[PDB]
Structures are given as C-alpha cells and as structure tokens.
C-alpha cells in the first residue's frame, strides 16, 4: 500500500512535468481576466 | 525625464519624454500604443 501510494505520487511528479494542458482550468482564468484587459484597452481606439 | 505638457507639430499631450531605440522610417513622424494613443514621436528640429 506505502509502495503503490509512492509509485501514485511519482505518476502525478511525471504527468505534470510531461504535459502542457493538465492546468488548463487555472490557465483559461488567467486567459479570461488577460483577454478582458486586452479588450477593455483596444477598444480605446474605437472612434464611436 | 520631467513630466510635462508637450507639443510636436500640433500633438498637444501630457507625460514624460525620454530617448528611445526605436527606428521610425523617414515618412514616420509619430508612433502609437494599441490603444492609438501616441506613444513616440520624431522632434521635427534634431531628427531623434
């Protein structure tokens, strides 16, 4: 059980390291707040 | 390197000016942010 618990955590260090998508529920948060400012700032240049 | 009002050929503004690399072309005299607010300007007396 201690071995397959620490075999478990050694998956979790590999697959983190490995992939770029696994943090994609904070990075879509930060995409949102980032594109949101993007947007607020571009639409100074709007003549209305 | 003061903040000051500022005026080039008729560009009426307000902020700080300081040296810049930036390359603008002959036929260029401003520069602009995203926002299209002026954010560099060719002196019309020393071409910097």
Redesign the interface.
């Known amino acids: 059980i201690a071995n397959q618990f620490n075999s478990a955590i050694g998956k979790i260090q590999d697959s983190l390291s490995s992939t770029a998508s696994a943090l994609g529920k904070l990075q879509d948060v930060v995409n949102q707040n980032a594109q949101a400012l993007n947007t607020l700032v571009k639409q100074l240049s709007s003549n209305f | 390197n003061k903040c000051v009002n500022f005026n080039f050929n008729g560009l009426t503004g307000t902020g700080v000016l300081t040296e810049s690399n930036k390359k603008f072309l002959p036929f260029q005299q401003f520069g602009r942010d995203?926002?299209?607010?002026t954010d560099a300007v060719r002196d019309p007396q020393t071409l910097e």
Do not use: P
């Open positions: 995203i926002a299209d607010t």
